[model samples]
Target: MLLNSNELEHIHSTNHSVNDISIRWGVIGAGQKGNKEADLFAGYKFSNGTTCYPTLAVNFAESDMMHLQNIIKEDRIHFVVTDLFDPETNPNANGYLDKLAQELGRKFTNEEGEVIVDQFLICLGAGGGVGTGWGSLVLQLIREQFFPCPVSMLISLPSGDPDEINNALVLLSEIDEFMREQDRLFGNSDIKPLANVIVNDNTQMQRIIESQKGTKDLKNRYVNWKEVANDNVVSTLHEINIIPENYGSDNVTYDPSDLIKLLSIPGRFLTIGKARIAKFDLHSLENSIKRSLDEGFFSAEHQFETATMYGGFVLRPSNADFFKDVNTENRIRNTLGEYKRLDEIAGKFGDPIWDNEYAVCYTIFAGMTMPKRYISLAREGKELAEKQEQLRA
Candidate 1:
């Protein structure tokens, strides 16, 4: 799943610099990976720079889309719920594609025939149908439309023990050509570096329970659970979109300083990778937080809040050799368990630092700050607020 320099450049060069660098992002897929893909857009907003619009290509009737809309309250995100190319409607496949090309061309076209989308992000899972099949096809069509622009792919490679290697192998091979063509390909391996930023849902749930147990008074623990969930969810979602200015280079390391700037804010909970690097030393973590606060990554109204961590690990095959064994179902289960464990470790922040999870705390010591609950509620009130503001003005 590694992409070489030539491929990397395509992504780097395709970046559009609009006023303040707002990019029109298109996401192609409709599954768990698609959900994660959408979360990336929402999370990036937490980084305090740049704006991204995420669109989902799935049927509105599908349950997955429903959950995605509920969880991610961003208005910029759009869902293309219409079915693609029902053979009966088109009668001829060419007619469907021709009409599709015309519509896409018109949507993206300037006065001339030129297409103008900021860029495209294609996300898919190798094992699944919607994400794997239709997702790849969308990538192909986008390439046809915008050949020079970069098309970054965030895909899930197969994983498991000796039992399910065979199917993994098959899927990996099938997607190899597509990977070669993509501008940037981020799989399990590539994601490792940024692991601290992204938070998986399963892991967050486990940490909440642990936090409840550890509380002394423990009455109406529901508030604490809600707080932990909101903070972690917000943190995890934020990590997905915080793209480093230096990403896509082999030698480019994540700026620990920049990451710390984001994580040290009150109510912020970092994933394992970030926690590992930040808390590599308590003194360093404290210093970094102080600097960030003084410089205003957090406002004077904002203050340090409580922190919790969780940890775990699951066994799975590496990306290099996913499909050696054939028991597909069991392999998938094992791979999922491993991911769950990694996420758990990130959430818990357990001791000895290396066990995978841990926890820490910083409350509103003092200052002008926005609470995580307000942030969440603001998201819910977006439409109403927009209408009222428009009327008032």
Candidate 2:
């Protein structure tokens, strides 16, 4: 969806100096999924000259930390081994929070010289008992005392796991309810976390496994699925927030400030579109953009047109005259619908080193209503449970 003219003006008219602000990402969770996400996040270099500020991985079991240890340097990754198994209502949870705050404090400071976090990406594996049990507690603590920045959650729902779907549903509901309550109690003036939520279903894992059933790359496909999902997310973040200073041309570009405005809309789901253009494919730019949007999305349940905000970046060959045609922008804007704000950037990145003149385009859609499929799934689960109870009777 695109931002309206008034909203667009308001975003551009903001008095706050965008240059003075920096984004600090904090990641917290338990299990392999958390480790995978943290690993990806740790390597990302934001325009503000920082990666993830403090990456914290926690689990009840010590053995789960093995893989994380090998991938992450000891100082970069904080491993918390809690004696208590429960994440929710655990007495020692405060201790972890304090440690997290201290770490963030040492890493980031606002213009006022006070420590602050710009964003929090909480990664959790729903099938993992500790992450499911304790995620809400961690979110609450971050919102209440530590960081009031926008919070985005990356939750992985495992396929064929009996409790995973239910756990995912519960956590989703809890996040929704808390967000609404915050708005109602303190109005929009108060700090509200959980601005965006991204979910990766391991059910897609099964899809890939079946699709590659007879292929020799089947074994590698499994590992690739995880890597691809993480890669897509990090790439999306990079493309959308590419700095204006990085571009050689004076073309209008979207920056971190624009991204924050688009993402600030309450209850918005993020979708990323990525495409590579070839020299022969100059005419197919629009199609490439659409295909990219189709390839990378959070859920299949919602339509793309329902988006309320839209923004994207296009990195074209430096010598290509493709963007000279104004119709290209028109077609993209029209295809994405009349979003409140449509910010598209076309920059010349020079000739392709490879055989094909290629460009990567990324799009972000925000302010979508929750999909009906989520509600229907919950209803179906409840009905199935009721039928089981009747059979017991």
Candidate 3:
């Protein structure tokens, strides 16, 4: 079943808060793909009182300058347009980022009306575009000087292109070094560690599409894949931050404070998952949750057993038969038995508008080991770069 108007209203109106620890999102996007996603998330209001307004954006390509200018004029969002010819060593790029940091510092505010930032969200394409290096440096400078909040990165990994993959590997390695160096220099005395790194691999989505159909139909599906990936990340963020009315009761509830505890841990990766199903039977509901764990919303496969912390929400019709099964919690628990800590929240949203049977599941996994393929890619990227240099000489 589809979500009814009442259910939609409840989902939107549910206040997501905990101990007055509100969050104000300062979003930054790097490159064309990042800019597009930032534009989509510009004015979204979360279940929490905090909202994501037009904060800061960067454009590496002059080709995108026209669109960014329009956004600046229409929404009063700050933007930096720089040259794409040589971003790695460009002085203008750094100068522009300094300006952006100052502008963002003045913008973010908390409930007490003081100028403070909670979380800094960055969207970047991993392939070494003109904005990739610039974006990474900007994050470093901001974390050190302007705003010392937990930085969360949402990075888009390259598809099957070798050059793109190599570029992505280089960028990832650089950022990893930056993060480690920061740890050695500060020793956790004053600086907050990097909060989370969420990755969206475009190759995984392409593989799913190719498995169903042929490669010839990929062009049409690419755009949809990007939008779906972005939507899933945004929705997961919203669900994790939700604070229901009966939070501490026996019923399911995972507050924002709980989420912060899980995500703020050093050297842990946060993986996001989501699923939607339309079947009233218990089996279908169970399968939906299982699929969400196995095949995440971003098309990446999650190793649920390795997760140290897990949290999720289930939205279902009041009349669904799964609630009557009584063994629903047991089944879910058995599925995620390996997780050391787990929290689940359930909300009954009455009837469905589009179908007679519908349910949605969103989940987050923390303390997971890094994927082996990413490490291999980094090694291969370094080798490829050395080969190119030898050939040039």
Candidate 4:
């Protein structure tokens, strides 16, 4: 389900720094969309993050050489590429979960028989049949075979045919139920719960990309919303992952544990929204947040105001960057205004790094129920699933 903050603070000190965050992270790609995503993710990581956030990616299919080398930006990539297809079998991908450990464990686990990979991020395009089928089993493998590790899923939901919707929502329903059950088993011997379930909607991203006027560059004639959507998810997580360890001297300090605590909220859905406009004020920040959750990246109508859990943070080059608009006293006053405004929405927030190159406000919501899109998708899926019943008749 979620992490116990006290346990995390005790085992992993609350005051850990970036250098201290030397833990291996693994990525699993279970389908076509996800395989490319896995390849691209390993490629996009910052050069300085080699030690603190080195990545290992695994996929059954081979990625294009251009995507492999151009995106990775490194001499070598740690990707497991092979074929899981079988010529004789109806479903060639069978027995995949059966023999995964022999191939993956050596790379992921260390000498102590413990999973050295502390965290895993799984990517799957639920729109496909075989991948989601394989991806779900991967979750089971992590719990039953591999050591206890926090896993957050990047579920790519689609805007497509009934078959696609049905296939995707079936996995969604299974996850909704399974994660709840897993959350109840707190001990390490049995199933462990997932950290976050971030849904990436294709339809919503298409709608919002057209809305983002400034992001458009006709000079280069670059057009690919899919890449932007993937980058948004990857970049947000990467930035947040690196921020907690940096040395910051703010009166209010936000650390790695705090970030972990929010992510570890058990059986809870997640929304990580970011806004970076020209100004920073109550109205602007609120719009930035709403636009993120309401219109950007996601295609859901989620009410952050009522989320059971809430956290947010603002990053700038320094306090003086924001202070240029308002004096020290005015900044304090604005802080109070922003704090109260956030309290009314969800609760407290963070952003403790002393220096950040970018000026952006990130709003996070946890412990939220399923969104309107999910409920609607399931309803559509229910009818489609039963429609096959007619064929037998």
* Alpha-carbon lDDT, every model: 0.33, 0.52, 0.54, 0.56
Per-residue lDDT over 1-393 for candidate 2, one digit per residue giving the tens place of the 0 to 100 score: 111122122222432222222244566555567766666555543334444345666554456666653235442434312334235747776676666566555545555766455677677775566666656655555456656566777766654443655766776677667655655665432334666666555654345334654566445533666655655555445334433223323365455555565555434455556565654243586676666554333443444455545555665555566654467656656655533234432111221111124556556665454544356556656776677567794
Predicted structure with the largest TM-score when compared to the true one? 4
TM-score for each model: 0.37, 0.70, 0.70, 0.72
To one decimal, what is the Cα RMSD in angstroms of model 1 from the true structure? 19.8
| Per-residue lDDT of model 4, residues 1-393, tens digit only | 111222222222433333444234567655657655666555533323343333444444344233553224332222311234332443444455335554456546677876766667777777677556655665555556453577778787876457788777766777777666665566322323577677877777767765665555552337677776776666666556655555343545556666666666534567777666446554664566556656766436554444555665655445545524445324433543442344443345554443324456566776555656777676766676677565876
Runs off by more than 4 Å, candidate 4:
1-24, 44-67, 70-95, 111-114, 142-147, 183-192, 213-222, 247-249, 303-306, 321-347, 353-358, 378-393
Model 3, span 118-175: residue lDDT tens: 6777777777554456556555554556555777777777744567776676666666
lDDT minimum window of 10 residues, candidate 1: 348-357
Q: Model 3 lDDT vs. the true structure? A: 0.54
lDDT for position 324 in model 4: 40
Task: Find the candidate with the highest lDDT and give its number.
Answer: 4
What's model 2's lDDT at 244? 27
- Candidate 2 stretches with Cα past 4 Å from truth are 1-22, 45-54, 69-93, 96-100, 103-117, 182-191, 204-224, 242-245, 265-267, 279-283, 303-306, 338-356, 371-393
Instruction: Tell me the lDDT of model 4 at 202.
Output: 78
The residue pairs that clash in candidate 4, if any, are 1-266, 2-266
Model 3 clash pairs are: 1-355, 1-357, 1-358, 2-355
